[PDB]
Design a protein around this ligand. Structure first.
Ligand code: CL
Ligand code: CL
Ligand code: K
Ligand code: MG
Ligand code: MG
Ligand code: MG
Ligand code: MG
Ligand code: MG
Ligand code: MG
Ligand code: NA
Ligand code: NA
Ligand code: NA
Ligand code: NA
Ligand code: SR
Ligand code: SR
Ligand code: SR
Ligand code: SR
Ligand code: SR
Ligand code: SR
Ligand code: SR
Ligand code: SR
Ligand code: SR
Ligand code: SR
Ligand code: SR
Ligand code: SR
Lengths: 172, 142, 156, 29
RNA sequence: UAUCGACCGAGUGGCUUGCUACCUCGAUGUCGGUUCCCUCCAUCCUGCCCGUGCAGAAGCGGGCAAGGGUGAGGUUGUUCG
RNA sequence: CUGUGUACCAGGAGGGGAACAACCCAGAGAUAGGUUAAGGUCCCCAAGUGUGGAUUAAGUGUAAUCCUCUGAAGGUGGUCUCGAGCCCUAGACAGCCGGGAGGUGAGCUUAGAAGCAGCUACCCUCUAAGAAAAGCGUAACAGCUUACCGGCCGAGGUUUGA
């Protein structure tokens, strides 16, 4: 089986062994698509994913490889963006970006700040009770977003009564 | 140092067992073999299961002792010893005329033995001697 | 006692009551279930087929039978179905309960010998196979692995 | 070859005298 | 199906008990304790988790996990309790 | 434990089976050359890192027999192979967008019940569709839906047996 991805006009793709690099105006991303007997190459202005194998396991990865590459095209052009909101009930939670990590202070009244380091060239812009995570690498972006929500995770008490935390409000 | 080897083998990306089999076969044939780039030789299968086996060998022991190597140096040379009658004169001789190295201390690029190469493009479930060594705690000298 | 002790046909046939005495009664309540007033004139006839020769004690025969029929009350106490457990526990089984001295055992129970492929249960129903589930529970309480087999149904 | 698709096309083509595919189907008449 | 859980059915262990009589009758000293060393996990505590008939506090049940810990005393030779 | 028939150990070497009374080859004068048996041919260790092809990713497995080599009932969209029925370029299956409409809030019941407490019936208009409402949801409404229809898309899909 073989699939051909026509690459967008503002974009450029390049191979280097098992690594692929996609570059658009919104930046660039480099990934690794290493699976047995699956060749990923850049032919002219198209990316080809092919293999002589057609078993369920090989077909699975081909489809995964495709989405990964279409996501890269989208990342370097329209970019990826996740929206978030901070909802607190009693203790005023302070969310801020300090350095390369987001810091949440006074969560549920805690005296110690919780923090998570941002992934890659992902930019986190906070404005009021809203947060917005964006960047070319969806993996890097997706994690950062999730990382922030996970940062206000609570296991000890009943979640139905304690909901203070930063939640993902918009998924691309 | 200085090991006047008749044969210099390149274990880079090669099935450790399969290389060891041929190297022993040759040492017993009188050849002086130098295995190079041990840190880069490989062994196929699930890394987690493979490491459990090598970790178990490290935990085993007692007063009499069961010294088991952790660096690719020894993991490999031990592997080869398991394919030699090292407690015998003839077998100790062969084994002693065999040395394994980290990287390549020689000027020549070692040769690749037939059938011993692993094709990274067709395999994903395999591990590097170097990776085992690091997981086993060895001081990454290479 | 465990099924382990009697599931195998490892002893000669011991069923002659003219020579054996004190045999415990059977725990099997009925052999005919459903509208046994009516005949097997139904569209679908499924059956539970034992996959290994074995001896099934009346103990397990009654648990499997109940397990299935009780559940077949997904159709109703007086529903429209038939159900027959066609085997009867003829083999009298013993237990040596003096060590190995004079160890012939005493009657402790009865079991039914069933050979690989024989059908132990048979149900008759209209396209209303809640019975296939009834046997999943039935095969759940008898020693051997079994296979549910639809005998007359092209009504997929 | 559902008949309802056959009959529908009949009804459509009849009104043309007095699914898009079923309209193009009637149009080819 | 938070939790408890009969019947019946399938197993694992080799800690109890029984069976057997393979080893030992030109001797392998018995129970309990004690002292000192190693280990097993089917985990009692401690670490990290999941569910709840989880507001909280505390329970209850479950998962990973054998690093460490698991003590003092009254009757009884007791083991056990 | 106790019978029976038989070959073996006992009283049976030698080759193999890691070791190993009775499992496999084998019944054996000395000595020698040769060819096989069982069993082996990646190394330890004599002989293949042999050929055509398939499956497996668990180191499953590399364990004939066995006190000795475990693995069961029950389960498995892990993966390979084979078959049957049905749907499909007159556009399936899925996804996304749009439409989901009047009689009517059906009648009964009840203070009230209007798709959705209960009982009963379960009709007809417009139409490309739209239930006397399948599932939530409200005190009841509402609101979210969904059955059903149209669009975009474009190739197999779905059900079942081995
Ligand atoms: Cl040691
Ligand atoms: Cl692989
Ligand atoms: K003695
Ligand atoms: Mg004596
Ligand atoms: Mg455990
Ligand atoms: Mg609590
Ligand atoms: Mg004798
Ligand atoms: Mg050889
Ligand atoms: Mg194994
Ligand atoms: Na050791
Ligand atoms: Na003692
Ligand atoms: Na512990
Ligand atoms: Na005491
Ligand atoms: Sr017997
Ligand atoms: Sr006695
Ligand atoms: Sr069963
Ligand atoms: Sr464990
Ligand atoms: Sr605990
Ligand atoms: Sr007592
Ligand atoms: Sr060779
Ligand atoms: Sr080969
Ligand atoms: Sr082959
Ligand atoms: Sr033994
Ligand atoms: Sr066996
Ligand atoms: Sr099984």
């Amino acid at each position: 089986p073989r699939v051909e991805l026509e690459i967008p006009e503002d974009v450029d793709a390049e191979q280097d062994h098992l690594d692929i690099t996609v570059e658009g105006d919104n930046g660039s991303v480099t990934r690794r698509l290493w699976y047995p007997d699956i060749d990923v190459s850049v032919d002219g202005d198209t990316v080809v994913i092919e293999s002589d194998e057609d078993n369920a396991k090989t077909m699975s990865t081909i489809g995964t490889f495709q989405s990964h590459i279409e996501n890269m095209f989208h990342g370097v052009t329209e970019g990826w963006e996740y929206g978030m909101e901070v909802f607190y009930s009693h203790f005023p939670m302070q969310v801020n970006v300090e350095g390369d990590e987001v810091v949440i202070e006074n969560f549920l009244g805690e005296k110690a700040p919780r923090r998570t380091t941002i992934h890659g060239d992902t930019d986190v812009e906070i404005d009021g009770e809203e947060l917005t995570v964006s960047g070319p690498d969806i993996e890097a972006v997706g994690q950062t977003a999730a990382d922030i929500e996970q940062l206000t995770r609570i296991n000890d008490k009943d979640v139905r009564v304690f909901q203070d935390g930063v939640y993902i409000t918009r998924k691309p | 140092a200085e090991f006047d080897a008749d044969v210099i083998v390149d274990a880079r990306d090669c099935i450790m067992g399969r290389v060891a089999s041929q190297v022993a076969e040759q040492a017993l044939d009188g050849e002086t073999v130098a295995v190079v780039n041990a840190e880069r030789a490989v062994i196929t299968g699930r890394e987690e299961q493979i490491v459990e086996k090598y970790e178990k060998r490290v935990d085993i022991g007692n007063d009499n002792g069961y010294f088991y190597p952790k660096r690719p140096d020894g993991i490999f040379k031990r592997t080869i010893r398991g394919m030699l009658p090292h407690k015998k004169q003839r077998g100790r001789e062969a084994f002693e005329s065999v040395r394994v190295y980290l990287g390549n201390p020689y000027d020549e690029d070692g040769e690749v033995l037939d059938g011993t190469s692993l094709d990274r493009l067709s395999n994903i479930k395999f591990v590097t001697l170097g990776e085992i060594s690091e997981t086993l705690g060895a001081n990454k000298t290479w | 006692k465990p099924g382990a002790m009697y599931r195998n046909s490892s002893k000669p046939a011991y069923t002659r009551r003219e020579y054996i005495s004190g045999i415990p009664g059977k725990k099997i309540a009925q052999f005919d279930m459903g509208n046994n007033g009516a005949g097997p004139t139904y569209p679908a006839q499924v059956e539970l087929v034992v996959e290994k020769p074995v001896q099934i004690r009346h103990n397990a025969l009654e648990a499997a039978r109940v397990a299935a029929n009780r559940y077949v009350q997904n159709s109703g106490a007086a529903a429209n179905y038939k159900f027959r457990i066609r085997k009867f526990p003829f083999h009298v089984i013993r237990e040596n309960k003096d060590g190995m001295r004079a160890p012939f055992g005493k009657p402790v129970g009865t079991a039914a010998r069933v050979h690989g492929a024989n059908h132990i249960f048979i149900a008759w129903v209209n396209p209303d196979p809640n019975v296939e589930e009834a046997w999943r529970r039935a095969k759940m309480k008898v020693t051997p692995t079994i296979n549910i087999d639809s005998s007359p149904a092209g009504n997929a | 070859i559902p008949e309802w698709k056959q009959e529908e096309v009949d009804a459509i083509v009849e009104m043309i005298e007095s699914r898009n595919t079923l309209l193009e189907r009637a149009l080819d008449d």
